[PDB]
Curated annotation (Swiss-Prot):
Family that this chain belongs to: Belongs to the sodium:neurotransmitter symporter (SNF) (TC 2.A.22) family. SLC6A8 subfamily.
Record note on what altering A214P does: No effect on creatine transporter activity
Outcome recorded upon mutating P483L: In CCDS1; decreased creatine transporter activity
GO molecular function: creatine transmembrane transporter activity; creatine:sodium symporter activity; gamma-aminobutyric acid:sodium:chloride symporter activity
Source species of the chain: Homo sapiens
Pfam families: SNF
Tissues where the protein occurs: Predominantly expressed in skeletal muscle and kidney. Also found in brain, heart, colon, testis and prostate.
Sugar-bearing residue positions: N477
Recorded consequence of changing V199M: In CCDS1; uncertain significance; no effect on creatine transporter activity
Main location: membrane
Membrane topology: Multi-pass membrane protein
Protein name per its UniProtKB record: Sodium- and chloride-dependent creatine transporter 1
Length: 532
């Protein structure tokens, strides 16, 4: 079906499946991460994915207009906008690093194959003997000393990195050119971009399985650690990983639903997209953890300490796989080209959605002469100004605050929980089921309304409560504990995303008159379109 490919290439299959899931699994521990993943996917992931798709189909509108079913909660739309903005702030940053790798890929010998270069510390060696626990692989040296120039901590920003600055600027001007032109990957390149990733990954997997110690890595990836289930860290990471990789709460899924026709088979669409996202994430995990197993066997250090536990694992594992290929530079170019294409597709969708939302928000009186190009130029420039913070020596640290807090973390649980509450307890789960039955003819499984009513909200609330009760300060690469101001800034992002719903609530309550009950009922009266 068109929806399948449109969503896959669009903003469903992307870095969140190839880059995010790997290091989330690595940080939480390989096997133990999978149980909350599948549990949330069956309980929170699939139901909310279906919710957003079919809500977009029903209302035939995206952005905030989709909440005309309950204008009193229209604030969720605003919240989504904020979230996607933060996403667009740091998502592109990954691309910059990837772009940098691509630029350094075109060489007879890859930069991260030998460590005899200038920036590499004397504590390195190309091949490892059976000092111990101190030697650093050339790939991590290239990732940190050169690509990142990682500083002591977030307290010290350091000197700006000009090469990554230029690469990020190139990514942003490319985003500007494509969004303004509206490339949309044509119609056949779409198909190519739908099938180009897996192919490359497949090759890696074959090489991945043909390595010493890849079995240890894969059993670490699969066999759960039953002790770790107690901590809420795994549950928050898995729930937010699904709500990120599925793009839950970012408003693009409602746009996908609106693009679809009213008479469409949305249930099978949602199930197959969930299966594709989960399977692509699982496949990327296969590749990454096979590579980690090979590195653990070759280093001699334990699997849990081989690579960086932060966002850089996808740039530690995947390039190493390329070094194992016969023609290394060609496969480096191919892999990083596919990664760049995936990121650009996702970022095009996100930036286009954000621009459409802003232009919808702004009244007709604020009609700029060049509103399209002016708006996209301002958004790109502002995002670049914010991104200058993540390019600095300590900038990687800020990226973590944009990863754990701005989009993922507590804010996504809050958004999804309020989604469930507004659609099920306010609008009416049974009435919504009747609407779905009218839309698609037949009726979905009762598991869906059970999930929306008192399963997904309860699970999200429980993870939230276990987080706040047993709060742990965020730690980067299990080495650097964040200070109170970094936590404060991350929570500033979190509250900026979360407060959109309660503040818009109080705003509507104040703008309304009379007794609280009657005005709350008036403001929550659904507003129907011409079709229904
Ligand atoms: C745009 N993306 C990337 C992804 O799908 O992982 C969102 N999660 N929204
Ligand atoms: Cl995923
Ligand atoms: Na995804």
């Amino acid at each position: 079906q068109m929806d399948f490919i449109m969503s896959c290439v669009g903003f469903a299959v992307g870095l969140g499946n190839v880059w995010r899931f790997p290091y989330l699994c690595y940080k939480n521990g390989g096997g133990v991460f999978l149980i909350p993943y599948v549990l949330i996917a069956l309980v929170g992931g699939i139901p909310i994915f279906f919710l957003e798709i079919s809500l977009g189909q029903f209302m035939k509108a995206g952005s905030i207009n989709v909440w005309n079913i309950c204008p009193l909660f229209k604030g969720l739309g605003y919240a989504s906008m904020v979230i996607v903005f933060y996403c667009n702030t740091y998502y592109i940053m990954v691309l910059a690093w990837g772009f940098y790798y691509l630029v350094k890929s075109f060489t007879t010998t890859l930069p991260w194959a030998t460590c005899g270069h200038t920036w590499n510390t004397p504590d390195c060696v190309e091949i490892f003997r059976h000092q111990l626990a101190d030697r650093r692989s050339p790939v991590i040296e290239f990732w940190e000393n050169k690509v990142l120039r990682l500083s002591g901590g977030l307290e010290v920003p350091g000197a700006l990195n000009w090469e990554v600055t230029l690469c990020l600027l190139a990514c942003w001007v490319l985003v500007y050119f494509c969004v303004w032109k509206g490339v949309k990957s044509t119609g056949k390149i779409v198909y190519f971009t739908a099938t180009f990733p897996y192919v490359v990954l497949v090759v890696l997997l074959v090489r991945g399985v043909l390595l010493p110690g890849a079995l240890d890595g894969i059993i670490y990836y699969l066999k759960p650690d039953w002790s770790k289930l107690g901590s809420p860290q795994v549950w928050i990471d898995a729930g937010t990983q699904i709500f990120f990789s599925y793009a839950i709460g970012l408003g693009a899924l409602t746009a996908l639903g609106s693009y679809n026709r009213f008479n469409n088979n949305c249930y099978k669409d949602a199930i197959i997209l969930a299966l594709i996202n989960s399977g692509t994430s699982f496949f990327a995990g296969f590749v990454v953890f096979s590579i980690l197993g090979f590195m653990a066997a070759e280093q001699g250090v334990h699997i849990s300490k081989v690579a960086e536990s932060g966002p850089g694992l996808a740039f530690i594992a995947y390039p190493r796989a390329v070094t194992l290929m016969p023609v290394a530079p060609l496969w480096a170019a191919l892999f990083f080209f596919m990664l760049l294409l995936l990121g650009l597709d996702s970022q095009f969708v996100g930036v286009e959605g954000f621009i459409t939302g802003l232009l919808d928000l702004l009244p007709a009186s604020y009609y700029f002469r060049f509103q399209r190009e002016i708006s996209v130029a301002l958004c790109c420039a502002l995002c670049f100004v914010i991104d200058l913070s993540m390019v600095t020596d300590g900038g990687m640290y800020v990226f973590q605050l944009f990863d754990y807090y701005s989009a993922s973390g507590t804010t996504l649980l809050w958004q999804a929980f309020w989604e469930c509450v507004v659609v099920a307890w306010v609008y009416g789960a049974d009435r919504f089921m009747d609407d779905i039955a009218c839309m698609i003819g037949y009726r979905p499984c009762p598991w869906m309304k059970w999930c929306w009513s008192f399963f997904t909200p309860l699970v999200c609330m429980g993870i939230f409560i276990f987080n706040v009760v047993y709060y742990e300060p965020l730690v980067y690469n299990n080495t650097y504990v964040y200070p109170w101001w970094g936590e404060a800034m991350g929570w500033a992002f979190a509250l900026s995303s979360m407060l959109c719903v309660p503040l818009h609530l109080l705003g509507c309550l104040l703008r309304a008159k009379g007794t609280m009950a009657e005005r709350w009922q008036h403001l929550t009266q659904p507003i129907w379109g011409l079709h229904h």
